[PDB]
Amino acid sequence: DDDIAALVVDNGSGMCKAGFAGDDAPRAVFPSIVGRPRKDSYVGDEAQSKRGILTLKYPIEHGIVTNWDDMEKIWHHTFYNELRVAPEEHPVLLTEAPLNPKANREKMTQIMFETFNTPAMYVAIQAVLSLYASGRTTGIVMDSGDGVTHTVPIYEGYALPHAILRLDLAGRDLTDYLMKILTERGYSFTTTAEREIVRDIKEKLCYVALDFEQEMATAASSSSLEKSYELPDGQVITIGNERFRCPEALFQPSFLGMESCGIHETTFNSIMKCDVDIRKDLYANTVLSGGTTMYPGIADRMQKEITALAPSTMKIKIIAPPERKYSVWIGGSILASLSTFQQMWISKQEYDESGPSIVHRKCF
Amino acid sequence: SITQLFDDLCEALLPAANRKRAKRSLKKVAYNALFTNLFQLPARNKILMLSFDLRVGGLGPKADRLEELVEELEAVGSVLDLLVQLAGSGPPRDYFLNNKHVGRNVPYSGYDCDDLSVFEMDVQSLISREECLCHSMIQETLQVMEAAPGTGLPTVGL
Amino acid sequence: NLNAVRETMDVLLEISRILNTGLDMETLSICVRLCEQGINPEALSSVIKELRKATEALK
Amino acid sequence: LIGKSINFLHQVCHDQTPTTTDLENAFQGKIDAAYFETSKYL
Numbered sequence: 001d002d003d004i005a006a007l008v009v010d011n012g013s014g015m016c017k018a019g020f021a022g023d024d025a026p027r028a029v030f031p032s033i034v035g036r037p038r039k040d041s042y043v044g045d046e047a048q049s050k051r052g053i054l055t056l057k058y059p060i061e062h063g064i065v066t067n068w069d070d071m072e073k074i075w076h077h078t079f080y081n082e083l084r085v086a087p088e089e090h091p092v093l094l095t096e097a098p099l100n101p102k103a104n105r106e107k108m109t110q111i112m113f114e115t116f117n118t119p120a121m122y123v124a125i126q127a128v129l130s131l132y133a134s135g136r137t138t139g140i141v142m143d144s145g146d147g148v149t150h151t152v153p154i155y156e157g158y159a160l161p162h163a164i165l166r167l168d169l170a171g172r173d174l175t176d177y178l179m180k181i182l183t184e185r186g187y188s189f190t191t192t193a194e195r196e197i198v199r200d201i202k203e204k205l206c207y208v209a210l211d212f213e214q215e216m217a218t219a220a221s222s223s224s225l226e227k228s229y230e231l232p233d234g235q236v237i238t239i240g241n242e243r244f245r246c247p248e249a250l251f252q253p254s255f256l257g258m259e260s261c262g263i264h265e266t267t268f269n270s271i272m273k274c275d276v277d278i279r280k281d282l283y284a285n286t287v288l289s290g291g292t293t294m295y296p297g298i299a300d301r302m303q304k305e306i307t308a309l310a311p312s313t314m315k316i317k318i319i320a321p322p323e324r325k326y327s328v329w330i331g332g333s334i335l336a337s338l339s340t341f342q343q344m345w346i347s348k349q350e351y352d353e354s355g356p357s358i359v360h361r362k363c364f
Numbered sequence: 365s366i367t368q369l370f371d372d373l374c375e376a377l378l379p380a381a382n383r384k385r386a387k388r389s390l391k392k393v394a395y396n397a398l399f400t401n402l403f404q405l406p407a408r409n410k411i412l413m414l415s416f417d418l419r420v421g422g423l424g425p426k427a428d429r430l431e432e433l434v435e436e437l438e439a440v441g442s443v444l445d446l447l448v449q450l451a452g453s454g455p456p457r458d459y460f461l462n463n464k465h466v467g468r469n470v471p472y473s474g475y476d477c478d479d480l481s482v483f484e485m486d487v488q489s490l491i492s493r494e495e496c497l498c499h500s501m502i503q504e505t506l507q508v509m510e511a512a513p514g515t516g517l518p519t520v521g522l
Numbered sequence: 523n524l525n526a527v528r529e530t531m532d533v534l535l536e537i538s539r540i541l542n543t544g545l546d547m548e549t550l551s552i553c554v555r556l557c558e559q560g561i562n563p564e565a566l567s568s569v570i571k572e573l574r575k576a577t578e579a580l581k
Numbered sequence: 582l583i584g585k586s587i588n589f590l591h592q593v594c595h596d597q598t599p600t601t602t603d604l605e606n607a608f609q610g611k612i613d614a615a616y617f618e619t620s621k622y623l
Contacts, residue, residue, distance in 0.1 A: 366556060366559055366561070369552055369555060369556040370556075370569075372552050373549060373552050373553070373556075373570075373573070374573060374577070376546070376548050376549050376552070377549075377573060377574055377577050378577055379577075379581075381580065381581070386577075386580055389576075390573060390576060390577060393572065393573050393576045394569055394573055397568055397569045397572040397573065398565055398568065398569050400568060400572075401564075401565060401568035402565070411537075414541060426540060429540075430537060430540060430541070433533060433536060433537055434537065436533070437530070437533070437534075440530055440534075442557045442561075442563045443534050443553070443554055443557060443563070444534075444537075445563040445564065445567070446545065446553060446563050446566055446567060446570075447534070447537065447538045447541065447543050447545070448541075448543075449543075449544075449567050449571075450542075450543050450544035450545070451541055451542060451543070452542055452544075453542055453543065453544040454542060
């Protein structure tokens with residue numbers, strides 16, 4: 001910062017990203033794993049190698065904290081090992097999921113201020129910080145991470161909680177449907193590495209569809225959507241028909257088997273339950289988000305569904321960057337670096353006079 | 365990549381000085397000023413309001429040329445709204461100015477000499493430009509004949 | 523489209539040269555390439571005049 | 582002790598990886614924290 005330097009930590013679902021404020025890249029990124037004896041409570045390479053006497057556990061599951069001790073372990077091991085700095089000279093920005101209950105947030109600020117002892121702190125929604133990187137202060141964000149997903153409306157520094165739509169579909173459901181469609185075709189799954197290599201195959205080689213009707217119509221007449229993969233393990237699998245239908249599960253939800261809503265009806269229901277006066281002002285610039293951009297092509301779908309959603313009395317002014325995956329990170333990094341943003345930061349004095357619970361009030 | 369077109373925009377405005385830590389801080393000022401404004405056919409009409417301001421100080425057919433090109437641009441509207449924001453960036457001949465000595469059609473118009481008085485200022489602007497060029501040449505050398513050492517010299521810092 | 527938008531950018535240069543716009547030739551090429559994706563130009567008028575103040579503050 | 586680790590790592594351990602009055606006595610603030618980082622990383 002300028003007075004007392006800020007620090008930014010984004011604990012994602014597939015990885016932990018930590019770093020200093022005013023840094024474009026994160027200073028350290030390691031995978032999301034927390035050890036336990038079946039060496040102990042490690043984040044990084046040793047825990048992944050020693051999964052024969054280590055228990056694989058993830059700290060954040062859906063946007064909710066499955067084990068609180070797990071979250072404290074990854075937070076403690078992130079601040080002490082992949083940063084190595086004294087907390088007394090560095091306040092930290094913490095992250096959370098949109099529409100998180102107040103008791104969870106009170107416990108989170110309480111546990112960071114007492115069992116870890118920060119000077120000052122902040123707890124942030126991820127999607128609003130992602131919007132702050134695209135320069136605007138208003139917009140509807142369609143956020144689909146690797147396990148965390150919401151369509152969040154926000155307009156002028158405030159989000160309507162009634163219209164923040166929590167979404168089942170995520171990278172969790174992505175790999176679930178990956179393994180399901182592969183065993184449905186006929187493919188053996190027996191361990192963690194087969195799940196990892198199938199996720200890598202969807203990340204690198206897989207076409208991200210635009211309709212189900214159109215690409216299947218071109219593939220039924222002549223399959224020109226086949227992409228060859230010749231593996232060195234000794235396996236020859238190649239099917240172009242499966243790979244365009246595999247990310248189709250967001251278009252119509254019954255492709256996965258999921259009860260929950262589809263993506264177009266979700267963004268429709270969110271803009272309908274957000275204010276009428278803010279609607280066109282929201283559409284004056286719509287924003288892209290989501291870690292699901294690892295194959296680019298979902299961006300075209302995001303612009304396409306937002307063209308069809310909002311009424312076109314204007315050419316769509318949607319901001320579509322390839323900063324979409326790390327948008328949360330760079331948002332936290334750019335906001336926390338500034339000195340005026342220390343007025344939105346919560347101090348120790350405020351924690352003592354009004355309790356921790358004011359974190360639900362001051363930030364949302 | 366929109367997120368890079370703001371990073372390229374701060375590169376043109378950044379001249380020689382670093383220039384790799386300044387580039388990161390100017391990438392912030394680009395976004396940090398985008399939401400200051402949000403907190404606190406009428407497209408071609410914005411040109412005609414400047415076309416009026418052309419014609420009052422003379423230069424009529426030049427303003428008639430400006431309106432032929434907005435006629436083909438509306439036969440792109442998001443570009444002009446940035447162009448009208450500044451009308452000056454300046455300092456802090458033709459035979460078809462007046463056709464009276466050549467041409468084909470000429471009804472005899474006598475004299476006015478008001479045409480000649482805006483033809484004498486066509487001359488006097490040249491005498492004021494090629495003199496101020498030489499005034500920034502004698503300034504550059506009287507600022508070196510006169511000074512004390514330490515004004516802007518890097519070798520006195522050694 | 524890039525053949526047409528390259529000529530629409532050269533014709534957009536002339537009307538800013540006789541109107542004496544503060545924008546130079548290269549920033550016009552950046553801003554048209556940014557505007558064709560779809561961005562509100564009314565927000566662009568606030569970023570440029572303050573970003574140009576902050577670069578002179580370094581100097 | 583901390584200068585015989587970095588030079589050792591760069592030549593004998595074959596890794597070029599990151600492992601990390603006078604002027605009102607600046608030394609003591611940096612040297613201790615740098616030891617507590619570099620030595621445990623080694």
